[PDB]
Amino acid sequence: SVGAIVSIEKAEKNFVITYASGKKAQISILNDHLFRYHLDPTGKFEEYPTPNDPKHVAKITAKTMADYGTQAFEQTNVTDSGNQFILENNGLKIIFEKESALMKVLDKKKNQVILEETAPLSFKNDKATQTLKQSSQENYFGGGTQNGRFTHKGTAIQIVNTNNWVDGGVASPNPFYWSTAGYGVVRNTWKPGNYDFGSHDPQTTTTTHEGTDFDAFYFFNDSSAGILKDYYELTGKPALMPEYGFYEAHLNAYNRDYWVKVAEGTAGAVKFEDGNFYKEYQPGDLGNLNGTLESLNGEKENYQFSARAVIDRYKKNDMPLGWFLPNDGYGAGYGQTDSLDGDVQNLKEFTDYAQANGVEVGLWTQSNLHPADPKNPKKGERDIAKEVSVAGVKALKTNVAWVGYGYSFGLNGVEDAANVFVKETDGAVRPMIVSLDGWAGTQRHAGIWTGDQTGGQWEYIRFHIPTYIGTSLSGQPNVGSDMDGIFGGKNKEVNIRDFQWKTFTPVQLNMDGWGSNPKTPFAFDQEATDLNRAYLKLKSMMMPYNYSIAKESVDGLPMVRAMALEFPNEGTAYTKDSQYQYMWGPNLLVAPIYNGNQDEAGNSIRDGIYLPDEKQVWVDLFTGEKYQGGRVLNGVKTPLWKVPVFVKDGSIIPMTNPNNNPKEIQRDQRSFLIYPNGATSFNMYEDDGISTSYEAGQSATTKINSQGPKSNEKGDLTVTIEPTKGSYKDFVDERSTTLDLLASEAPESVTAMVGGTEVTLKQAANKEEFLAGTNLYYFDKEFQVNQYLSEASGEKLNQSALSVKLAKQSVTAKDVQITVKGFINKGTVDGGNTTVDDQLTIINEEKTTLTLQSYEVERDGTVFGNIQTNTATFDGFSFLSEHTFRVRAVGKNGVSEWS
């Protein structure tokens, strides 16, 4: 410990703190709510921490201290105020007790102490520990990909390159955490650490990293978006994936292995298009067997075993496919020639075939990406410059055998790789890198996948949902995983459920070749295949919404949003009551099926569906069924065909035609699925979908406003689409417009203004007239949000919608204003009467393992509904914990008093 503070002096560029021991710290003020504190026992105070190898030159920060400017520092004063030294600017008071040396930070906007040290920095055992106050309602997020977890109050997390891909591990650590008090901290170190959020004293948080340096950035902000924007300004804004990255990929090795003809029912046998069964062998495992060697292009009397054959299967099965890695396998390679250049030419011919099918090609790596002599490569070396420039590769996956060292290694590797994609293509290809073993800053170059786990079991879904939520809260919005796992399989229900929820997530990897069955969306029976296709096509139709929330994630909230990001005023949104559900952007609440519990009919039973906000109507995306917020629903029956997805009434959801890749999208059309509820808005983002030009302002945005009656009420609706702002390569100006307005009755009238000139709308007599015509409206009681799902489920899934179509116009030169008189979208709302009713009435010790004796129950101040009998069970409790309950009855004029 460094003892009392003897002085704080304002030097040329920072405040210098001298402690009684002779040790010094520098405080650098970067803006009115961000400062760096650096206690350096060496007295060198160099700008950057020492990495694990001097060749690791990529930095945690993406913005230098100098880049922030001197203005906040100029406008910060140091005062000697009795028992304290105080640094003060317009944003913060940073207060130091002289004798104890303890720091606390007052946020001047809030006029509240946000961060307070309760014990001095500790440097024992070659570690640097900070000890902070923890308040009773204070919650904590971050730490990177904390497998299984998102909300850290009362727990410790390891900030370690664990190389552990399952529940309880850390696939990708990040020395970044933030507090709901309104602060975030990046420890400016490459060393591992451990953050203890009061797992001992609930009133104490400790943060530890290896080393004797204490260097940290502290940022104070009153919104979660603001905390993440501070982290992004400091360590780099997330890369925006190219459009094709949001589509499922196929990953395997097609250069190395043999297929041996075997009997049907042989262990590991797979049936092929010749009607025969084969078993796959690595060359070292053939022994005396003869088999057919795989290749990428199927040029060697081996076509069905080739990478091209796999692309042909995705197309035959009418499945979306964005990108393909054909060298994903140890020592597999991408050519069977005697030279690197021979192999690159083989990969080029594969890329030409894939691109002719609307598929991009990526490469896996287990190694460095450059030859020892780039001008004289050896067979089996890698050359990412030639792979990109000659073979047309656009994406990269970094395997743990490359980046497994962690910390400064990974960031160096992905920064170099991102630079090669951009430099070799002159900016025509933006990075598409999937990695792990990341650190602070990784998001600016790469997304992560969670590593290797076993699918075909419910645990595969259960631990992944919080994994994705916590990755996103750590400043990494580009998160993905294997579709039904790299290992295991042979469980149809888990396969369908994994394709269902991952529709509403960024990255989907069919990681093939290691499992109990091949890894494709068409590996199970026709029912599974049709359901997986229906969900994959829904993601394709949602790409304008998805790419808009992706753009928001570059400098704002992530795509997978913890409930607390959208509903910060509700306690339930911060706890494990929110571990198995999330907001996919602002408009969709996703509550995946994650266990095998079923009703007598074989429907999944979903417990703990948390619907926020007692004033908010939630609408079943598939059926139109309406639910009141402010409640947690238990016992929700969910058929195999269905995943629980609720639209936030008010939502505008930009949509497109179903498509198997970005080249199949109709760029001369736009379409909006709108659930009118008061005054709502959406900003639709677009760009060339592939280049770095979005970073130089080549992109366009379109604002859509919906101004109507509140949920279930009748009145005027105005939908306005403001003129499109911006331009980019091959921008399409002339587009037709479709509005699909969920509605319960035909309107009194529908009128249209296009750039201030009236357009006459005819009422279509029938759906056939509507589909074939333009400048029409139609009130449709057979509106299907997803016809693939109607056909796959065997249910019509009909909804009522007022649809409007306008002819092609210039989207830049002319706005759209549509006015509907007598607009109404009314249905019965489950829990719709939230008032208290005076006219309404009001522990079973036997099966404690708790059960009390329709109805609602408050459990620790959280309200549970859909309780349709006198009794109800609440599980998910600690072995010998205590809880607090009361009950009320539910009738058509409201709910009783409690108890």
Ligand X SMILES: CC(=O)N[C@H]1[C@@H](OC[C@H](N)C(=O)O)O[C@H](CO)[C@H](O)[C@@H]1O
* Least distance between ligand X and beta carbon 484 (Å): 14
- Is the sign of the CA dihedral 70, 71, 73, 78 positive or negative? positive
> Does the footprint of ligand X cover residue 399 (CB under 6 A)?
yes
* Least distance between ligand X and beta carbon 327 (Å): 9
Q: Which is nearer to Ca ion, 70 or 266 (CB)?
A: 266
* Least distance between ligand X and beta carbon 249 (Å): 12
* Residue span binding ligand X (CB under 6 A) among the ranges 4-12, 111-119, 185-193, 322-330: 322-330
* Residue 568 backbone phi and psi in degrees, to 5: -65, -15
* Residue span binding ligand X (CB under 6 A) among the ranges 328-336, 518-526, 614-622, 770-778: 328-336
Footprint (CB under 6 A) of ligand X, residues 201-260: none
Q: Which is nearer to ligand X, 454 or 701 (CB)?
A: 454
Q: Which two tokens stand for residue 630?
A: 């402010």
Residues 6 or more apart from 343 whose CB is under 8 A from it?
333, 334, 335, 336, 337, 379
Residue with tokens 């960031």: 411
* Least distance between Ca ion and beta carbon 333 (Å): 11
Count the Cβ atoms, other than its own, within 10 Å of residue 343: 27
Of positions 321, 507, 511, 542, contacts ligand X by CB under 6 A? 511
The 570-589 contact track toward ligand X, x by CB under 6 A, reads: --------------------
Which residue has the CB atom at the shortest distance from Ca ion? Answer: 257
* Least distance between ligand X and beta carbon 764 (Å): 51
* Residue span binding Ca ion (CB under 5 A) among the ranges 120-128, 250-258, 422-430, 767-775: 250-258
Pick one of ligand X, Ca ion, none as the site partner of residue 686 (Cβ within 5 to 8 A by kind).
none
Q: Which is nearer to ligand X, 162 or 671 (CB)?
A: 162
* Least distance between Ca ion and beta carbon 492 (Å): 24
* Least distance between ligand X and beta carbon 449 (Å): 7
* Least distance between ligand X and beta carbon 509 (Å): 8
* Residue span binding ligand X (CB under 6 A) among the ranges 99-107, 324-332, 721-729, 888-896: 324-332
CA 818 to chain centre: 34
> Does the footprint of ligand X cover residue 362 (CB under 6 A)?
no
Helix, strand, or coil (residue 619): strand
* Cα–Cα distance, 693 to 660 (Å, whole number): 25
> Does the footprint of Ca ion cover residue 253 (CB under 5 A)?
yes
Residues 6 or more apart from 12 whose CB is under 8 A from it?
none
The string of DSSP letters for 474-519 reads: TT---EEEETT-SEE---HHHHHHHHHHHTTSSEEEEE-SSSSS--
> Does the footprint of ligand X cover residue 170 (CB under 6 A)?
no
* Least distance between ligand X and beta carbon 623 (Å): 37
* Least distance between ligand X and beta carbon 453 (Å): 10
Select from 558, 576, 596 the least CA-distant residue to 457.
596
Q: Which amino acid is at 543?
A: M
> Does the footprint of ligand X cover residue 329 (CB under 6 A)?
yes
Q: Which is nearer to ligand X, 104 or 256 (CB)?
A: 256
Footprint (CB under 5 A) of Ca ion, residues 589-608: none
* Least distance between ligand X and beta carbon 386 (Å): 22
Q: Which is nearer to Ca ion, 187 or 256 (CB)?
A: 256
Residues 6 or more apart from 774 whose CB is under 8 A from it?
736, 805, 806, 807
Footprint (CB under 6 A) of ligand X, residues 430-489: 451-452, 486
Pick one of Ca ion, ligand X, none as the site partner of residue 257 (Cβ within 5 to 8 A by kind).
Ca ion
* Cα–Cα distance, 593 to 605 (Å, whole number): 8
Q: Which two tokens stand for residue 225?
A: 């978006």
* Residue span binding ligand X (CB under 6 A) among the ranges 40-48, 325-333, 615-623, 782-790: 325-333
Q: Are 334 and 347 in contact (CB under 8 A)?
A: yes
> Does the footprint of Ca ion cover residue 257 (CB under 5 A)?
yes
> Does the footprint of ligand X cover residue 421 (CB under 6 A)?
no
Q: How many residues bind Ca ion (CB under 5 A)?
A: 3
* Residue span binding ligand X (CB under 6 A) among the ranges 327-335, 342-350, 372-380, 878-886: 327-335
* Cα–Cα distance, 206 to 208 (Å, whole number): 7
* Residue span binding Ca ion (CB under 5 A) among the ranges 289-297, 377-385, 558-566, 733-741: 289-297
* Residue span binding ligand X (CB under 6 A) among the ranges 97-105, 262-270, 323-331, 470-478: 323-331
User: Would you give the end-to-end CA distance of the chain in angstroms?
Assistant: 53
* Least distance between ligand X and beta carbon 226 (Å): 34
Of positions 123, 177, 350, 364, contacts ligand X by CB under 6 A? 364
Q: Return the HEC string of 812-865.
A: CCCCEEEEEEEEECCCCEECCCCCECCCCCCCCHHHCCCEECCEEEEECCEEEE
Residue with tokens 């499992």: 515
Q: Are 293 and 247 in contact (CB under 8 A)?
A: no
Of positions 328, 360, 649, 688, contacts ligand X by CB under 6 A? 328
Q: Which is nearer to ligand X, 165 or 176 (CB)?
A: 165
Ramachandran class of 194: left when φ > 0, alpha when ψ lies in -120 to 50, beta otherwise:
beta
Footprint (CB under 5 A) of Ca ion, residues 293-332: 294
Strand order in the sheet with 92-97: 77-81, 84-88, 92-97, 103-107, 112-122, 127-133, 204-210, 193-196, 156-159
Q: Which two tokens stand for residue 497?
A: 């459920």
* Least distance between Ca ion and beta carbon 282 (Å): 8
Q: Which two tokens stand for residue 401?
A: 């055998």
C-alpha gyration radius of the chain: 29
Q: Which is nearer to ligand X, 268 or 794 (CB)?
A: 268
Q: After which residues is the chain broken (C to N over 2.5 A)?
A: 842, 849, 853
Pick one of ligand X, Ca ion, none as the site partner of residue 451 (Cβ within 5 to 8 A by kind).
ligand X
Number of H helices, E strands in the chain: 15, 61
Pick one of ligand X, Ca ion, none as the site partner of residue 328 (Cβ within 5 to 8 A by kind).
ligand X
Select from 751, 771, 684 the least CA-distant residue to 722.
684
CA 598 to chain centre: 29
What are the distances in angstroms from CA 134 to CA 129, 470, 881? 15, 20, 22
Q: Are 506 and 246 in contact (CB under 8 A)?
A: yes
Q: How many residues bind ligand X (CB under 6 A)?
A: 11
Select from 138, 140, 142, 96 the least CA-distant residue to 121.
96
* Least distance between Ca ion and beta carbon 300 (Å): 14
* Cα–Cα distance, 334 to 342 (Å, whole number): 10
* Least distance between Ca ion and beta carbon 499 (Å): 23
Q: Please tell me what DSSP assigns to residue 241.
A: P
Pick one of ligand X, Ca ion, none as the site partner of residue 877 (Cβ within 5 to 8 A by kind).
none
Pick one of Ca ion, ligand X, none as the site partner of residue 465 (Cβ within 5 to 8 A by kind).
none
* Least distance between Ca ion and beta carbon 321 (Å): 18
Q: Which is nearer to ligand X, 161 or 616 (CB)?
A: 161
* Residue 713 backbone phi and psi in degrees, to 5: -105, 155
> Does the footprint of ligand X cover residue 530 (CB under 6 A)?
no
Pick one of Ca ion, ligand X, none as the site partner of residue 364 (Cβ within 5 to 8 A by kind).
ligand X
Residue with tokens 């497109």: 656
Of positions 5, 132, 396, 400, contacts ligand X by CB under 6 A? 400
* Least distance between ligand X and beta carbon 468 (Å): 17
Footprint (CB under 5 A) of Ca ion, residues 703-762: none
Q: Please tell me what DSSP assigns to residue 240.
A: P
- Residue numbers at the binding site for Ca ion (CB under 5 A): 253, 257, 294
- Residue numbers at the binding site for ligand X (CB under 6 A): 165, 328-330, 364, 399-400, 451-452, 486, 511
